[PDB]
């Protein structure tokens, strides 16, 4: 597909992806800040607080109440589309996706 990332360093990172790729991997491919490099998708960390644009959350489908709960346990605020991007992946359902990065969290 096609894609569009965002961040607080460039305020945008237009890109593209392929069914099976996450919005965290495109980044590094798009030269995006790639501000993560934590577990690499191993599913052992929870700091990859990425944010899908507010148009594709209903397209991407944030994480279930399992991965979203453990993260909410802390008590920090969250918006619509906040989910482990690294755990997300492209499909002919989320083509031309638009990503986003939260504030210093
Ligand atoms: S990068 Fe570790 S869970 Fe997303």
Swiss-Prot record:
Family per record: Belongs to the adrenodoxin/putidaredoxin family.
Organism phylogeny: Bacteria, Pseudomonadati, Pseudomonadota, Gammaproteobacteria, Pseudomonadales
Top-level taxonomic group: Bacteria
Protein name (database record): Terpredoxin
Sequence ranges assigned to domain 2Fe-2S ferredoxin-type in this UniProt record: 1-105
Entry's Gene Ontology BP terms: P450-containing electron transport chain
Cofactor binding mode and count: Binds 1 [2Fe-2S] cluster.
Coiled coil (residue ranges): none
Protein's job: The oxidation of alpha-terpineol by cytochrome p450-TERP requires the participation of a flavoprotein, terpredoxin reductase, and an iron-sulfur protein, terpredoxin, to mediate the transfer of electrons from NADH to P450 for oxygen activation.
Amino acids binding [2Fe-2S] cluster: 39, 45, 48, 86
InterPro entries: 2Fe-2S_ferredoxin-like_sf (IPR036010), 2Fe-2S_ferredoxin-type (IPR001041), Adrenodoxin-like (IPR001055), Adrenodoxin_Fe-S_BS (IPR018298), Beta-grasp_dom_sf (IPR012675)
Co-factor requirement: [2Fe-2S] cluster
Disulfide partners: none
GO molecular function, one term: metal ion binding
Alphabetical UniProt keywords: 2Fe-2S, Electron transport, Iron, Iron-sulfur, Metal-binding, Transport
Pfam families: Fer2
Cellular component annotations (GO), alphabetically ordered: cytosol
Gene that encodes it: terPB
